[PDB]
């Protein structure tokens, strides 16, 4: 619940990004502060993101919820798998 409240606060006042491609772009540019991934993810698809995070030394959080759950926590009506926070 703490992570959901924190993400709600970030969305209210911050800068974030949804999508694997955009998250990878933020990692490449070095403008990322934290990456959150849902649990129902394909192994290779999640492995590429985890490898990039490890290479860039960026902290990574595992949501332990569905992508629909992550979308609802984000307060949207669509499913999201990956989230990248650029400014808190």
């Amino acid at each position: 619940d703490t992570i959901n409240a924190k993400l709600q606060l970030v969305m209210k006042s911050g800068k974030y990004v949804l999508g694997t491609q955009q998250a990878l772009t933020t990692l490449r540019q070095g403008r990322s502060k934290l990456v959150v991934i849902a649990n129902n993810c394909p192994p290779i698809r999640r492995a590429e993101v985890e490898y990039y995070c490890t290479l860039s030394k960026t902290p990574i959080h595992h949501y332990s919820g569905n992508n629909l759950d992550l979308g609802t926590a984000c307060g949207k009506h669509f499913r999201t798998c990956v989230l990248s926070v650029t400014n808190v």
Binding site: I44, A47, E48, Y51
Partner: peptide
């Protein structure tokens, strides 16, 4: 093109995981 890219990435990442696991086992053994 997407299938080729997926195969390339999968090959590289699997080989890295295998190397790390084997090195860890040998370092625990020695």
């Amino acid at each position: 093109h997407d299938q080729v890219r997926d195969r390339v990435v999968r090959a590289f990442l699997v080989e890295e995981q295998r190397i790390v696991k084997q090195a860890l086992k040998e370092h625990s053994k020695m």
